[PDB]
Write a protein that binds this DNA or RNA. Sequence first.
RNA 1: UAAUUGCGAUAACGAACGAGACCUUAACCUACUAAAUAGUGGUGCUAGCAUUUGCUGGUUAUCCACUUCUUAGAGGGACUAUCGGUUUCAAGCCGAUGGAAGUUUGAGGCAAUAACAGGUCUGUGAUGCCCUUAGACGUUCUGGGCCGCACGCGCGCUACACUGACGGAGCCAGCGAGUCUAACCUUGGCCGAGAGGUCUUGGUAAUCUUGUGAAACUCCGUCGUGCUGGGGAUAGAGCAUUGUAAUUAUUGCUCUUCAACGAGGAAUUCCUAGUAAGCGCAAGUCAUCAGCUUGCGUUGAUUACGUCCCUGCCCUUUGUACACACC
Lengths: 63, 143, 69, 145, 101, 141, 206
Amino acid sequence: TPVTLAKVIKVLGRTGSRGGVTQVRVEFLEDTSRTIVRNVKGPVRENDILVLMESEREARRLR
Amino acid sequence: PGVSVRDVAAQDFINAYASFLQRQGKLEVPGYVDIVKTSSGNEMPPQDAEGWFYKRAASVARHIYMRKQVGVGKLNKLYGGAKSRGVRPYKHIDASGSINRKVLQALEKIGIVEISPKGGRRISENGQRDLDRIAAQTLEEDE
Amino acid sequence: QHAVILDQEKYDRILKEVPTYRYVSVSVLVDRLKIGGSLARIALRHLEKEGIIKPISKHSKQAIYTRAT
Amino acid sequence: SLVVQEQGSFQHILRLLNTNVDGNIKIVYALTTIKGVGRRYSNLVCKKADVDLHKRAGELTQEELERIVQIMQNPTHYKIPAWFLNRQNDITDGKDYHTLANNVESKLRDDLERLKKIRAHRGIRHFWGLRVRGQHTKTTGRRRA
Amino acid sequence: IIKIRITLTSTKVKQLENVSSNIVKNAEQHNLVKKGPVRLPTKVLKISTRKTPNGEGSKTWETYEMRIHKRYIDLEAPVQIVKRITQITIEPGVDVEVVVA
Amino acid sequence: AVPSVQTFGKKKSATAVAHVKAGKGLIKVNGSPITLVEPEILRFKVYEPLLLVGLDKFSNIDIRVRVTGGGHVSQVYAIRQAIAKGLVAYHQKYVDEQSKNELKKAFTSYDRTLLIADSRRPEPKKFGGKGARSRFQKSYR
Amino acid sequence: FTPVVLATPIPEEVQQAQTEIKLFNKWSFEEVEVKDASLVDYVQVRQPIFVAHTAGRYANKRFRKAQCPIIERLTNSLMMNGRNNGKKLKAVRIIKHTLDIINVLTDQNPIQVVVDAITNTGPREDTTRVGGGGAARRQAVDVSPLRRVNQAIALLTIGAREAAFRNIKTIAETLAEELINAAKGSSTSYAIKKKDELERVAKSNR
RNA sequence: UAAUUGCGAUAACGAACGAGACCUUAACCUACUAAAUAGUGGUGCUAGCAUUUGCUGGUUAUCCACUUCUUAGAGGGACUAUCGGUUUCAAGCCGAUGGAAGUUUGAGGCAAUAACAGGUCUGUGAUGCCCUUAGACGUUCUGGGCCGCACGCGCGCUACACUGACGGAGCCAGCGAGUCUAACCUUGGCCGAGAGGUCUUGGUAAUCUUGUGAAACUCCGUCGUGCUGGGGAUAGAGCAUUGUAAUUAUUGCUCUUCAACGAGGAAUUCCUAGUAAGCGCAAGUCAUCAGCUUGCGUUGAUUACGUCCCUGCCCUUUGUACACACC
């Protein structure tokens, strides 16, 4: 189980048709430089810690 | 150092006083004790068919002590409950007035309550006595 | 289905199996053994007067018990 | 702390009033399978027959089972009030009868036939298979079967 | 002297408060114990018609309110000054009744 | 002579008036002791103003609380108001203002509305529904 | 602990275990920590509470419900399905029996069991619906730490409710055995099965 | 910005209506005005325990004092106050503290120009035109019908049970209504299983009904996974109340009869905090009937703090062979 932790450093905004998906950029909590942008479902604040199944997708804007 | 019914809990005092009325002997209980549903909104006669009347007498005597005085209509509203009228919604239904009147008449005969001015029944001179006796050893029941 | 009366082959099934249970209740007596529920409430008082189980909570809708030793 | 160790006199499904009475249930609700007595009537007849209510119907041997049934046929001579009776001043005789297991159908059919042959409005509605009391039938009452 | 009571019932507070002030104004210019204005809780009379003639439209409901204000003053006075206090205080919207005993 | 402070506490309809006078330390509610307040699971709610600041503060003050209005849960939240308000008003008036201060700080740091009534009030019902916001079901055809 | 004699009786078992450190009914709020990161400061068991009954306002702000104690959040999800709506007194009694039962099987702190059961039951990858035109495709996305707590309480109470519905065991016993089985990865609980099914659906949809 | 709300830019300037302002209601006041038709404390008389000086009471005004609680007059208080952060440095927005109250403080009332062949001639002694006007389409009286049931639809009530049913015990509100030439709200005593009957009493009402001792709720016990003791449909017999009259059961009570229904397909409604939901109570209609409505209080949540995806709405641009205006 390669569970990778991350923390939201900036909330970009909402995405999806109904606006129930929030797009955030996350800092990787294990190395400084790499930051990936993903999308979440529930309510996120600033500097809250996240859990990723796999940090490979590089999620784009939902339709 | 002097205790009253207000210093002891409601449930254990009523159980102790009904048990005291059990071992005392005379309460001239009516002949319809095991026949009557005790309410027009109830469904079944009381399950403890041997001591429900004595529990009603103990609860009524406690209610008279804490209040100024009560009538049968006040007791009917107090002991009544919601009636399941079937397909129609529930509503509040007063209790049986004959049992409450027979309880009050039984209490007057043994001398715990008396008739009162401006209506209703207040507790008697010995009524504060025997209530505070049963209020007394209920505190020292724990060995 | 569930027994409602003891028959000398369900009395003995209490004494050397309930002291092997860390949690007993009304639902426990009717699950591991096949008893009719009304006896389960009776048996919890039977193992109360003599020391088999001890109470840590008493309530008319839920009775939770543990072993005496 | 109230168990008994009775094993021999316990009985299975048993017959009272030519009706199968369930054995391993409480006696007050065991008698309720007799069509003509209910929960409150069976509670009264158990108290009048000096029957402990906590005992199952697999207990209660023959002789006070006869006491229970003798109470059930004849309630009036055992200080059971007249308003507890099933039929009081019924339709012909003026006496009080509590209809029991097999007579409930007969007394109802006799009642239904009496107001049918009299050609009352209730009998014609009963014969037509419609609702006999004053209830609307425009919407409810479907699937007569 | 005799003990009387002046009770005022009104629908207008402005036409009631200054008259009750005027009733008590003629009451301390010469000295006597007041037992002054005790204001009972106000009574709101509610009528709820729907809105409309015959029931077409959205089911809109109304509420019409009538407000009742009540006060009573318990005074004691000789008989010749009980008379001209309830004749000079005549004013719209308020009724005045005097209890003799 | 007989230093006594009266207070009140409110919860949604209820009003619990508490008299805090100097004495030996009895805390009676409606003539019954504080151990007899029987919704039986909010018993520690009437105990929370008693035991947040220590039981030794009640060693010399007699508190008598009478409740009216509200419900069974609403009355309990009104007693614990009047206990905390009665304690802090007694210490404001009759003993040192330093003593009054940490009582308020102990109640504020565990603010279960011990000192401040919540301003939540029931919204009125409007027509066209069975509640303040809810509406009757419409069928459209 | 120097007990104080007083005109009020206030019996000895009350103040002996609370005046030094204020507890639950009788349970310690110390030494319990969220073992699983990203569920810190969203699972709140810092300040102790005597009972799980607070007339507090948590819906007035967006993230204020995270400051509510999770024991009281479990009781709030217990009073559901219409007939039990607004019956918090029953829900406290349910949770009082439940914490006692949980200690009986597993001899550790029932608060600690509840906390780690919340962490183990939280889904970690959910799937959203992207409409477009026609097939209504599904897209796998992440899940907020707050929603992980929200779905954990929702799944644990629903599985406890469904198991106790047509069953002789009480709701308190089914809630306890659900939290026990969800404390570990036993997969005999409804909440763990639902969380695993949700994650493997999102794994296929990614 | 909730707002054609404002900052501003400007061939516009200066205005008016709508919005906002306003009014009502719910929140805060140990500040005033004082209340035996609201309470509180002491004082007298007196009860029970303890006795040690105490606790719980009663005492229609025994008396004295006060207005915290309750009432209602005049007022005060919030204006996003203070601080921090963002923007063209503005209108504003966000975070924290303080505050009873920081979403326009919550909720209403009121509410533009223009229009609909919307509803109402069955509210009107509002009314035009047509009809009828004595065997009347007037009016009145006797019966019946509006409720009639192979079936289809909409609003609901009760349930499918153990977070429960039943039996005792605790006992907790708010909005209101109530009779002089007429029988209104009814306390209390007695009789009755209950429904109810009888003798009196209080009230034209902060006075009495009434603390409306409501229900869900809470303990203790019975039930034990079984269409069972969930459910009470349908039906039989009897007892009472209102009414000139109860049959086509008015309604209430007692005994018996013990159906479907095991969480409901496609669809579809409502809802963001004291809110949904659960629960009962008063009023309307009333002579009798509430499963309806208007309000009220009790218990009291999950989830959002967004988007235009579905259904619609406002503004701008744009196309048009549409103007009865995409039906």
